[PDB]
Homo-oligomer: 93 residues x 3
């Protein structure tokens, strides 16, 4: 279980932790053993543009739409980013 949010959107730590906690909760869909991270990369681009954007890699779920949807709400609401600027990737020690 691993979720990483990669984004040029800067949030305060209290708010990052809230968002990550909400995603872990999401990731009901399929625990105590799980990584999540919020990686701030100001210079991150998509579509030739450096304005607000979120890449999310989720590893290890097959269900997947319910997760993606739920996550896309969380990020759109907590990060005040346009949903057309969110990409969600699944990969399926």
């Amino acid at each position: 279980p691993c979720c990483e949010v990669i984004t040029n959107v800067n949030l305060p730590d209290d708010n990052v932790q809230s968002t990550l906690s909400q995603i872990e909760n999401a990731i009901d869909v399929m625990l105590g053993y799980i990584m999540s991270n919020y990686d701030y990369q100001k210079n991150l681009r998509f579509g030739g543009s450096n304005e607000a954007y979120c890449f999310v890699r989720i590893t290890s779920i097959n269900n997947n739409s319910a997760l993606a949807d739920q996550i896309t709400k969380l990020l759109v609401s907590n990060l005040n980013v346009k949903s057309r600027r969110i990409y969600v990737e699944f990969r399926d020690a």
Copy 2:
């Protein structure tokens, strides 16, 4: 696609953005892959090492032949814009379900 530049070389944001723009152009030109459809990123890791040494260095992951023309063209840009030695630039071509958030 995704291009990520991973480097202990610190550049100002105006310069980072230029450099990334030049690479996207490169990928786009040399590979004929769709423009706008690419992530690029510049990840600053001051403690990044290669060869036992923390001197200036660039790792470039390209994710998802012509390939040398790209690698070459990128290696100029980084050497020129980052003022780094070309002997300290490694270019890695690297290889599931995907979604946009507008579908929701």
Copy 3:
């Protein structure tokens, strides 16, 4: 050859470089070290188990892996003052590279 340590544990640079040098030695002991990258990526908001307490993810790409894993887990436990229960080690065997 690439080792990346991903952790919310903040260390001073002198100490980070030390730790990375010790790992390269490990990876080397268990080819030689001129053909390798290592990095220590500080992500303060990194969580595991629903908790932001000290933790280490290590990706090691392109290399008896147990000898490596064990030896690195000692280094990180010692140098980062972190609980071994909070350290996970991944190997990847994921394709070419091209300056000098």
